[PDB]
Point group: D6
């Protein structure tokens, strides 16, 4: 109802700044910060790929990428608007579906045990600092849920 387009940009910018702080001074290169109790070359890297196929940061990076493309299409069409919202919804929903099916959040595995091939046996791989992630997520998740609801609202109003 016209207020929506405000809170969308507010939460958009907010989620962006959070995504920056996350990627920069938290996640970080996590891996390196991924301590595998072992001595078997590739055990750590493979356990990481196994339990962190697509890191949270780059999922969210892609989330904002794809879910800022239709809103850019409209800007070109001017100088389909409802369609760009529909997209802006299902994408932001998709990146959430893949998230929950992958990491089974919102928690953040404190400790993982990997039995990958290089690894001689089941070894204790430690995640690094994961309260300060389980969280950021939360925010990056909640913000997405709201950003859904507002877009669904506008979409529904425009079908009236």
């Amino acid at each position: 109802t016209s207020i929506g387009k405000i809170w969308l940009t507010v939460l958009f910018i907010f989620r962006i700044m959070i995504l920056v702080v996350a990627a920069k001074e938290v996640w970080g290169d996590e891996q390196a910060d991924f301590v595998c109790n072992t001595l078997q070359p590739g055990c750590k890297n493979v356990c990481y790929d196994h339990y962190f196929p697509i890191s949270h940061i780059r999922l969210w990076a892609l989330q904002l990428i794809f879910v800022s493309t239709p809103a850019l299409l409209v800007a070109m069409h001017v100088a389909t608007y409802t369609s760009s919202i529909f997209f802006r919804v299902i994408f932001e929903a998709a990146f959430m579906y893949v998230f929950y099916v992958m990491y089974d959040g919102f928690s953040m595995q404190r400790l993982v045990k990997c039995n990958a091939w290089p690894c001689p046996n089941t070894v204790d791989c430690f995640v690094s600092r994961p309260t300060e992630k389980t969280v950021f997520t939360v925010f990056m998740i909640a913000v997405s849920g709201i950003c859904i609801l507002l877009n669904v609202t506008e979409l529904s109003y425009l079908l009236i």
Copy 2:
């Protein structure tokens, strides 16, 4: 009033920058756990430093720069935006004092986390600075509260 808020805002930003980049840095790497047991250190971190000071304060400025944007958007709630700007800035203090029990920085913590074979001496690096920079980043918050309380109450 409105002047000193923006002054201390920019001031706290600059302080926060210097803190994050030079003082704190990647505190972890700069964290020395007397042991040899993979993950004792990292866990003893997430225990004694769940959310680092820098990433609390980043969030502080974020959430406490959000209401001030809503007013600039309505101009195609001000008093409400202040109310928010207060309770957030208060909350980010509450979580701070309940968590770290400041304003002092623990020079040394002893961790008996599960990975750790036993109680081990984990050293923090450069706690004196870190304290100073909290002291500033806290005092500034207290003041920013007060000025918003007088502005809000006056109106």
Copy 3:
């Protein structure tokens, strides 16, 4: 038509940035050769990763942003600039598929290079992502081809 080209162009740029900076990174350092023989790893790199994906795609965008500049210069050849913009973007795909035999990222390669005393297990790091980001950076190319084929043929 012209719109979706620029959209997917900027899109592929952003994808390429995230890839180069966060995903790939300095892949090498993040490359773990089960051995202890100086240069076994590096050689086994230049064998199985002659030109990294990032520095192919950097060149892709370069060469496939060159014809589009000639037209802006003539304005003190357009159809020819498209023709180029196609065959380059096709070439950078040909070299890709002939080289790495994608679209999948080899999880593990076994190198018997000269420095290596024998066949040794060299592990690649994080191939799943890397695959995903290729899949996007390839699909985008296929589309960018098609749209230029319809635009070129139409004219």
Copy 4:
């Protein structure tokens, strides 16, 4: 006498650029460049905190921060001027007092011997490259002394 406000900005910018070169390609992360002849976890970090409580760079960072706040207050008052100078003096004096009482400059301890608790005994901790600091300081000190005198001058003239 109107020439003062020029040389203030000149020396201000000069000290800034010097502060950059200092922090970036000299001091650096000093610590790391702080070689403690030992093998006792935390001996180096504690000796460092003991003998470098607030590093020179961040003292000076704070110096320019606080001593560019009143000069910003006036810019807001326009769109008290003498008061902003008084502040601009006593602060720049304060950051000098704390400096001399802390590091007893202008020299720069080439070598320090630390008997902190973690350290088993008195150990030789080495500072890293300290001619190329003892100096920069000098400059960052002298510039401050001048920047005092010019502000005291203006302040005194304005009391006439």
Copy 5:
């Protein structure tokens, strides 16, 4: 013939972007990525200085530096033009002469054997990733050859 001044700037920008990607995500700090089969302090550094006196990146950096100075002189003379080209040619030719006499390209030694003084004997020093250099070069060379020919062309036309 007026088209020249276009393709010069095109190839100039192109070579620049290539020089960036080269220096940043390829060459890199090569050295570090220079594996000397040894254990003798300074053997690697000296073999490097011996076989890579002036790295390719900084040769090319200097190439663009010197070969963008006359074209800047003219911009000052306006607010000698043929002379600035003559320079722009012989310099770009010089940086090629030094290149071929130094590295005997366009190839890129995959492996070098160094018998420098620190080194106890002839040791196998490995260059790091050199298909992905032998190349970039190629480009940075070919572009230079073309950028010569176009400038020689303009120069010759202006002598008519």
Copy 6:
């Protein structure tokens, strides 16, 4: 005259940038002292490299870009600003030649500092480049002197 000064000024800036960032770098870390005695290397640095070339030249450009700012300030002394601009640029040469005894870069120095148990071989890294870049950064200074001498004398 005034033209070639600014040309060579910007030129020397670019040279200085490349030197500081790529050639010199953190020279220290790139400094290999044949020993095992904590602080032998660092001291042998501050002995044979008191003020690195990069941080002399940074200061050179600073002090020799200061007088040229005073004139832009007076415009709400020019000849005096030149005189300064000469004697500084001369001084930064004097300290250079008296200190390092250039223009050559010492390939290898032998340090018998106190931490060092004895005379030890400390290797410098990549002295040939470093020499070249001094040669340019020195020649440029000599020229910048001459042009200011002719401009100053002419007036």
Copy 7:
């Protein structure tokens, strides 16, 4: 039948010399020669104690000790003879019972996987050279079986 007392001493001496070669130039300090794929202090020692409570060598040492005591008692009684045999049998039988119930021979675990407390997880501990043990055993076992049968024979004859 009088020939027995010969072959007893023959096989006794034979088993002794074999026990020497075993303990000296085979078993050895086995442990040290017990490679636990790990890095967790005490994992190897505990896995060893778990899977080699009483090493083979010292079982056999004790075997010959106890099973040369009655045959010494008789030598004192002279300067009960059947009783000393009965003992000499049941002991040599006992040291075999404990052997088979402990190591489930005659094989010799080439590789053992230990999940002891110090060990972070199930880790691959390697036994060292175990064809050249599985064997010696065999001999030290077979010899015992024969040394039983001969003593049982004499014992039975003397009950007639």
Copy 8:
């Protein structure tokens, strides 16, 4: 009686030899203290293993083979030599049980000695054997006591 004493004497000697040479060995080296603090291990030894079992038993056989030599010397006190031979052999048991609190061998001890930064896990090696060999070397002592008590009392 006199027979079984010499039998069990020679027996306990052989047992003691095997213990000292193969089982115990240089126990220390075979002692694994979860730490990295020079002397934590050694001190935690002298605390939990003041006098090793082998060097108690060596002394046991020494002192309990001394009276039996005096009688062979008088023959150029026998009952007195037995009395001694009893009280010594009893004493070497008393010190054993009061010290180690056997007959079991402590599989694992946790030491908080001064050198140690904290309580650390020190592992003993091969305690099961060591127990067995004590069990024999103790039982033998108990018997050697009894037989001397019956011989002494009988007389």
Copy 9:
């Protein structure tokens, strides 16, 4: 005949002693497997050196000094003791040649055992000697066979 048997017997003993103590030694420790994978080396031992030469020959002299003791016992079968003394000494040769495929000592073996990540170069130490000492310890056996064949056949 009987003389030269005892001569060559004592001779082969001395040779065997020097071999076991100085030449072979603890061959293992003196065994250098180009790898870093716990147990690759040990397994590659038990594969390529199931029963070391020293502990075959120890057994050779044992079993081939057993029949010669039975005759000294019967004297409170001689021809039978020779027959045994032959077939044993023949057997210990058969197992040798079928196992190691001598008389040469493999300078270098390449092991792809399970622990090993791949085929790795395991070096043997000092194979030339070891060969020589086999050559003697084998030739001696061949002769000791022949003399017993002539003595046995003659009778």
Copy 10:
């Protein structure tokens, strides 16, 4: 009084066996078992030479050597007897004097702090297992004191 010559040989043999067990399975190569909290080549060796100039074992070795020479002289004179005792006393007294002035026993420094030249500073050197030495000593000392008194007794009786 004739009983003396018995208890001398008894205590002589006793002290010998104790000296064996000491040197073999206790002292050992002590050094190696001498843990100097440092990383400075020669600090440990020099601190050892400083605080253990002549190890206890070799003092006692020499003690028995010299104090079994006169008792051997008499055996040659037969195939001066009082003189050989006088020697046998003053020597055994000498080796005790040097002992007490050197190690200030009977205790055994658990921990020593060495500031020798190689050592950068006062460092904590740890002695290895010293209850099980402080002791043996005791015995090797007491036995000497008795062996004195018995020889002094005989000597005095023979002066009557």
Copy 11:
């Protein structure tokens, strides 16, 4: 001339004791004491086998072995004498021939440079303490030369 059989046994025993001291407290396990400036598994072992095929100690061990067999044969023949000398000569001559052709003595390579296959290149392998070998040899050589001459003398006298 009857004096020969004395000096033979004298020099025999002398050479034996020298051979003991050599093998025990000099040569030693030399290898270990064989420092190859490298880091390439097997380079040291192969260079050793290359330049020390049969170590000096075991050549000499074999020398005394073979050259004490005929002198034992005669002892059996009694309870051919000239033949046993002839052997005793040619053998002791043989072990000298193999020695000089192998090690080209009497010197003792202080330093050897090995280019074996495992070794990446020509590497500096250091022999350990070789004055104190070049020597012992000398003695073990000279003694052999004399022990030849005396046996040749006796042999010649017995051919008269």
Copy 12:
């Protein structure tokens, strides 16, 4: 006279045994060269310790127990055997003093051998003892000379 020779002979033997086995030991391993250059230490040994004291004295007793055997052989030259027994025992002193410049043991030597990059501090271990044991093993020699001089001269 003849008595005290054999006394001091056996005495010097026992001293030599204790020296070789416990004091000196494998001196090398117990030799600490402040460096990291393969073979600097070993060479600096053979320079400052060509023939170790133990292996000089072993030879001393050998050569100075050889003449005393010739006399026992002639008994199926005595004065000549003494003369030899003197000049040898004198020679083994001459080589000692000319070589090591005793009687003191060099606590510390500084080696600039070829392998060594420079002059490096090589520490000797336990020189005080070693001195003492030389002092005895030398004094004994001086006496053994004197007694043979009086015996030889008297005759």
